[PDB]
Every structure is written in structure tokens, then in C-alpha cells.
Amino acid sequence: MVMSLLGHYNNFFFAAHLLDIAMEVKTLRTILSSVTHNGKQLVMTVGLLAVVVYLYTVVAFNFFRKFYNKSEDEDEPDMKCDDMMTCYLFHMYVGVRAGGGIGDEIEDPAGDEYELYRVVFDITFFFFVIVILLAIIQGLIIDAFG
Amino acid sequence: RQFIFDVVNEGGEAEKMELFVSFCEDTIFEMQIAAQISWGELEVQRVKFLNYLSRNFYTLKYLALFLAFAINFILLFYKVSDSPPNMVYYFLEESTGYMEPALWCLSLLHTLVAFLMIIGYNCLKVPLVIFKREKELARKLEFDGLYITEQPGDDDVKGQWDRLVLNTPSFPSNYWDKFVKRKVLDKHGDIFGRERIAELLGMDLASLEITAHNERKPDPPPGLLTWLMSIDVKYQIWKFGVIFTDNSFLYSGWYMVMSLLGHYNNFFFAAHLLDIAMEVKTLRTILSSVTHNGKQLVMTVGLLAVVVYLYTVVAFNFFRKFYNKSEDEDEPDMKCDDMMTCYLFHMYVGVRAGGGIGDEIEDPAGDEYELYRVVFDITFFFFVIVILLAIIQGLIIDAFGELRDQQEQVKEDMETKCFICGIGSDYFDTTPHGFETHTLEEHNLANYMFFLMYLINKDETEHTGQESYVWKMYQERCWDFFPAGDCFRKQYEDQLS
Amino acid sequence: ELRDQQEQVKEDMETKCFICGIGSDYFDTTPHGFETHTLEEHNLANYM
Amino acid sequence: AESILEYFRPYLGRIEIMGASRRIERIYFEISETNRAQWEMPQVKESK
Ligand SMILES: Nc1ncnc2c1ncn2[C@@H]1O[C@H](COP(=O)(O)OP(=O)(O)OP(=O)(O)O)[C@@H](O)[C@H]1O
Ligand SMILES: Nc1ncnc2c1ncn2[C@@H]1O[C@H](COP(=O)(O)OP(=O)(O)OP(=O)(O)O)[C@@H](O)[C@H]1O
Ligand SMILES: Cn1c(=O)c2c(ncn2C)n(C)c1=O
Ligand SMILES: [Ca+2]
Ligand SMILES: [Zn+2]
Ligand SMILES: [Zn+2]
Numbered sequence: 001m002v003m004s005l006l007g008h009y010n011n012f013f014f015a016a017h018l019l020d021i022a023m024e025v026k027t028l029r030t031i032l033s034s035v036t037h038n039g040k041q042l043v044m045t046v047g048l049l050a051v052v053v054y055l056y057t058v059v060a061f062n063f064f065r066k067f068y069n070k071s072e073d074e075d076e077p078d079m080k081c082d083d084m085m086t087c088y089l090f091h092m093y094v095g096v097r098a099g100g101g102i103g104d105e106i107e108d109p110a111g112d113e114y115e116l117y118r119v120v121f122d123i124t125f126f127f128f129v130i131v132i133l134l135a136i137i138q139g140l141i142i143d144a145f146g
Numbered sequence: 147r148q149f150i151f152d153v154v155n156e157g158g159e160a161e162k163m164e165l166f167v168s169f170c171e172d173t174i175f176e177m178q179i180a181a182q183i184s185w186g187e188l189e190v191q192r193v194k195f196l197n198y199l200s201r202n203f204y205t206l207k208y209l210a211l212f213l214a215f216a217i218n219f220i221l222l223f224y225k226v227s228d229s230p231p232n233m234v235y236y237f238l239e240e241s242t243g244y245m246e247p248a249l250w251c252l253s254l255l256h257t258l259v260a261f262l263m264i265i266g267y268n269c270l271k272v273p274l275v276i277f278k279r280e281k282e283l284a285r286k287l288e289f290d291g292l293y294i295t296e297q298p299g300d301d302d303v304k305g306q307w308d309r310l311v312l313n314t315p316s317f318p319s320n321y322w323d324k325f326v327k328r329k330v331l332d333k334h335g336d337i338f339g340r341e342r343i344a345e346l347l348g349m350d351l352a353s354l355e356i357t358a359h360n361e362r363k364p365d366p367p368p369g370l371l372t373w374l375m376s377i378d379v380k381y382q383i384w385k386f387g388v389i390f391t392d393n394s395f396l397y398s399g400w401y402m403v404m405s406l407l408g409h410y411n412n413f414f415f416a417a418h419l420l421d422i423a424m425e426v427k428t429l430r431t432i433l434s435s436v437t438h439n440g441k442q443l444v445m446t447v448g449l450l451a452v453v454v455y456l457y458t459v460v461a462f463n464f465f466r467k468f469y470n471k472s473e474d475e476d477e478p479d480m481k482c483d484d485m486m487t488c489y490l491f492h493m494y495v496g497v498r499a500g501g502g503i504g505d506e507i508e509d510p511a512g513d514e515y516e517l518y519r520v521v522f523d524i525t526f527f528f529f530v531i532v533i534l535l536a537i538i539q540g541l542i543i544d545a546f547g548e549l550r551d552q553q554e555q556v557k558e559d560m561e562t563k564c565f566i567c568g569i570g571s572d573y574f575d576t577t578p579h580g581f582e583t584h585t586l587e588e589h590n591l592a593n594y595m596f597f598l599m600y601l602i603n604k605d606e607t608e609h610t611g612q613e614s615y616v617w618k619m620y621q622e623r624c625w626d627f628f629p630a631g632d633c634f635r636k637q638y639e640d641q642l643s
Numbered sequence: 644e645l646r647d648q649q650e651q652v653k654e655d656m657e658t659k660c661f662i663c664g665i666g667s668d669y670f671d672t673t674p675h676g677f678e679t680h681t682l683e684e685h686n687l688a689n690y691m
Numbered sequence: 692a693e694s695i696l697e698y699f700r701p702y703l704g705r706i707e708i709m710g711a712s713r714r715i716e717r718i719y720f721e722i723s724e725t726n727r728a729q730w731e732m733p734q735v736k737e738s739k
Contacts, residue, residue: 044428051419058416085222100498119494139543160675689704
């Protein structure tokens, strides 16, 4: 009721009912039931993420900050690690996203001086979040149907 | 609950009963400790103190977690500048001066409660981990002759480090049985060297002053200060070489040396955000599922390293003209002019991405080894991306099924059988609820344990007659009196139902 | 399927004999009997 | 005779064949040390 009366004020709020379908269609309830059933194990595993990328943020800020950049215009504008909490929001919008890792958004490290500290820092990141954590969030769904 | 869980889904099925008696004999020790927690100055104070911090054990734990989830958040306001208030790590607070100090007062606390976690563990849980080990030495000598007939393993570590305790005259300190040294002397005794086992189990003057304790009992002299020499230093080395092997007092050590270190860079206080996943009952389950299939995970990451080695040798011997790093001409930075330089293009820009060294190695439309490039790329894509990164999914997605199975055998074999006999839920359902009876008045775990504490309390001359039998058979260890297959209803089932 | 196939054996060679075909049940009317029926009576080795 | 009966424990085998009179009968016999010795070597055990 209070979505419809409100809709009488912007006529777009009438969109929320397209969202009851998934609350009828006997079949649709089953699928969604399977998702919601394993649901604390889903929220706390998204949790465990936030903290893993916090450890990668503290290691980036204390060592690697010269490798981050945002322009070709000279005079070094937009260095994305000059503050914590700015740095922690590069590691999620352009961090856990994509499909390769902060490795594709942070210059290249061929010219020695902390080189083999970058390749070891990227490979261990790729396995420990992309390959494992985005497989756990899938395993908790596939097992719920079983 | 934990004992019942790990005796149905491991190797019991015969010797489970002696484990149950072993289960009773250390809950016996645990209940005694709980009763005890519920210069005269020194004494009184020491005690009352060590006993507030050994009941409040779990609260102090969670508090550490809250205090570190705090200090970690106060760090997400550090900033860097080339001009000070070299680059300076000053604090960019929320305008108000109330953060630069509080971070200075929540560090010293994080290093006080850390000290209590160590002191506290050393009195709540250590006495039990000694009891569970001092018990084994007695039982592996009285009935096996481990240190009399043979040699322990000639290879193990916790079978010869304990050779350093038998000689001291304080061996039975916790195991109740303060005579685990005289009644081994008599069983082996004559067949072995009577005069030589009199000293290899310490306890000198045994062959001469055996019955010397016959006249009477003397009185000990009190005192102070000078009492600090009555330390059987040799026994202390042994126990202080056992507790440093327990997985617990070394996850408590690495809490302390992270905090003291944090007092040096204040960023090392980050490692506690990483204990969360070691509490939250739920989080342990998830991670347990990951670690359980863990050799099959390490060796499959292995099998990779070698597959990309065979691709590296084929690239270096044929295709090296297709690699490049610049548009500037004069051919700089050719990534295959050396091996080992080439093997580290195949992992940073190799197994990475989602298409394959095919997207980072020029194009091959101009003939001359063309259809040798397309066949080299497609077979690479299937043999590492589609298979090997599907196996590392499979070893995780399967482990939840195995761990949720193993947790549905118990809850279906402790509700369709007994645990002392072995009969079914069936037979006992010929009447109104009978299986709910057979395990509330007849057999019933608990009842059997509280016996073992009736017998001990009562004097010997008065044990009735059906007790002197089950107390002359717990001493020797010949467990046969448990029913294990027969029931009072089953035997007398006609004489009267 | 493969970790299944490896959990039929370890549960059918611990709930049956291998010469006769009787169960773990019957042979549990006394103190440990199934551990006896396959240590002195039937017992692979002995037959070889 | 708790010496003879104990010393000759790992030397007699008990079999439970059925034949002739359509009835179960027991068999006793003797096995040499070398006969049993060449049985616990790891190669044979994995074959089992
Ligand atoms: N002697 C016994 N034989 C078989 N099962 C028993 C016996 N004693 C207890 N149980 C099992 O324990 C349950 C009854 O006890 P209880 O309710 O305490 O178990 P629990 O639920 O695991 O423990 P709690 O109720 O304390 O959480 C029954 O399911 C029963 O099968
Ligand atoms: N005649 C038999 N009938 C049924 N099972 C038997 C027989 N003989 C041996 N077994 C099985 O083998 C096990 C006992 O022998 P043993 O311990 O040698 O098996 P194993 O553990 O596979 O081999 P090993 O102990 O040499 O590694 C029991 O689980 C039992 O079920
Ligand atoms: C004499 N005695 C005890 O005093 C004892 C015990 N189990 C624990 N205690 C304390 N047993 C089995 C025992 O025989
Ligand atoms: Ca009497
Ligand atoms: Zn019963
Ligand atoms: Zn049989």
C-alpha cells in the first residue's frame, strides 16, 4: 500500500511490483529459497573479504605507493595512495573487480628495485581472493540445491 | 558433544569402550580444578588474583578483538606529505585533536590484556595437557615395558624426550597414582635386573631402604626464602619442553610479539583483524572446509608450474620472434632473449588474464608458422584455464559436501542405536516409547560416570558386593562387565514382560 | 563419483564378510564377535 | 599349558570348510615361519 500511494507522487515507484513476481511463481520461490537458506555463511564470507583486502592495503601503503598513478599530464597529480581510506577504495572499485588483479591498474615493474617483490605480491593476491573466495561464494550456492 | 562426535566416525567399533573410560578419567580431573577456583599477604593475594583471571578467561579474549578492530580503524586516517606538519606520516584526523592521543592510549591496553591471556592459559588449561601425557608413560610401562623391554621408536620425538623424567623423584605429580614407580618394580622385577631398575627409574636406596617407611611419619620443617632450592630442576625442563610444543601456547605467543612490535611501527597491529577468522564459530567451519582438502590443493598448484614449463621450452625453441615490448623501433626489450626472463612472462602475464598468451604476443596472420600459433594457443587455453582452474574449484565445492556429510552420520547414528550396547532403535519399539526409556533409566552415559565417582568416595570396607567387582576391574583393566550385546529386557523377556 | 567409489569399499568391508556374506549384525550377539569371525574363523590369509 | 599354547599361537590355522556329510567342520594345520614371513613384505600387502 505505501508504495502505491507514493507512486501517485513520481509514477516510477510503481517499479517495486515487478519485484513480487519472485514471491509467487511456485518455482521461483524454490530457487530463491536455496539462495537464502545458506545466508549467514554468505554474509560472513563477504565479510572475510573486507579484511583480506585491508591487509593488502596496509602492505601497499607502507611500501609500493610509487607504482600507483592516474595521469600522463606530468607534475604527478592524483597519486591514489597519498592517504589511507582513499587507498582502500581503489582496492574495491578497481580492486576485487576485473579478472586479473591490482596488477592491471598499477604500472609495470620491469626496472628492478623491488621487482620480484611485485610479482610475488600479485600472484598471491590472485589466488587468495579471485580463485578461492569467489569459488567459496559459488560453493555455498551449488551445495544448497543438493 | 565433541567426544561423542569423534568416536563414531573414526577407528572405534571395538576399542571404543576403553576410550569412554579414558573420557571419564580426565573429566574427573577437570571437575576437581573447577572446585578449587570457587607473606601471608603474598599468599592470599596471589591466589585471589590468579583466580579472578581464570574465570574471566573468555571475556578478556573478546575484548582484545574489540580493541583491535578499533585501533585498526584509527589507522585509516594516516596521510603522507613531502612538507612536514623526507615524507612524513602525520595523522589527518577528523579536524578534532581527539585521535592522535587515543591511539596512544589504546596501544598500551592492547598490551595488558595480552599479558593476561598468557598468564591465564598457564593455569586454566595447562594442568590438563600435562595430565593427558603423564598418564601415558605409566600405562606404556606397566603393560608394555616401553623403557624396559624395547626402545620407543628410535625415530620419534615425543617418545625419547620424556626419557628425562623417570629419574627424578617427583614423577607422579598430577596423574593421581603416586606409586607408579613401586608396582612396576614388582611385575618385571626378577626377570630383569632387580638391582639396575632400582636406579634407572630414579628412586635410589630402593633395594636397601625399601621398607624404611615402617616406623612412623615425620613432620616437615616450615620456612621461607631458603625454600627456593627445593626445585627438582630436571623435572621442570621436561614439562617446559612439552608446553612449547602444544599448538595453543604458540598462537598465544605470536599475539604477544606482534603487540610489543607494534609499539615500534603502529601498523603491525593489523594482524589481529586476522583472528576474527579463528573465532566466530561459523568462520571456522568455512575455513576448515578449505584446509581439509589441502595437500590436493598444494600439489595441483604444483602440476601447474610444470605445465607452463613445457610451454616455455616450446616458446623459446621456436616462437621467440612473436614477443615484443615497444613501438619505438630498434627491437628493445625482446622478452625471450633469455630463458628465466621468458618463464616470468608466462606467470605474471601468462596464467593471468582470461584468454591466454595470445593476448600479449603479437598477431599471426602473415603466414609462415600460422597454423602452428593457433594450435599452440587453443590447446593452451583448454589445458590450463578451463581444466586446472576448474580442478581448484572442484576440490573446494566438493569439500562442503564431505564435511556436511560427516556431520550427518552422527545425527543419524546417535538416534538409531545405543552407545553402550549396540542395539537398534527397532527392537526397543515394541511398547510405548522404549528407546526413549532405554536411554533415560537403563543405559545412559551419565549414570555410568557418576558411578566412577561413587566408588572412589566411599571407603573400601563397605563397598557392597556388586561394586567390589567393578572396582577390582577398573584397577586391573579388563573391561567385560559392560553389557555390549545384551539387555535386562532381552535376557528376561519371558520370565516377565 | 570417485570419492564415492572410495567409500563403498570402506563400508562394505566393515559391515560384511568376504567369504560368507553375513552381516556385522548377527555376529554381535556376544562380546566382540565380528572382530573374532574374521581373526580365527574365516580370515582371507588362513585360506591361502 | 599356557606356554605351549601361547608359543604355538602364530603357527596353527583354523579353516571352516563344508563338505561330504553336508555339514560344517573345522580344519587345523601347521604353517612354517618362512611361509608366513613372505607375506608381510610391503609388495604383497599392497596387492591385497
Ligand atoms: N546411553 C545412550 N545411548 C545412546 N544415546 C544416548 C545415550 N545417552 C544419551 N544419548 C543421546 O543423547 C540424546 C539425549 O541426551 P541430550 O539431549 O543431552 O543430547 P544432546 O542434545 O546432544 O545434549 P544436550 O541436550 O545437552 O545439548 C539422545 O539423542 C540420545 O540418543
Ligand atoms: N575374512 C575376512 N572377512 C571380512 N573382512 C576381512 C577378512 N579378513 C580381513 N578383513 C578385513 O580387513 C581388516 C583387517 O585386516 P587388515 O587390518 O590387514 O586390513 P587393512 O587395514 O586393509 O590391511 P593392513 O592392516 O595390512 O593395512 C578388517 O577391516 C576386515 O574387515
Ligand atoms: C583410585 N582411583 C582414583 O583415585 C581415580 C581414578 N580415576 C580418577 N581418580 C582420581 N581411578 C580409576 C582410580 O582407580
Ligand atoms: Ca563388608
Ligand atoms: Zn542400551
Ligand atoms: Zn564369515
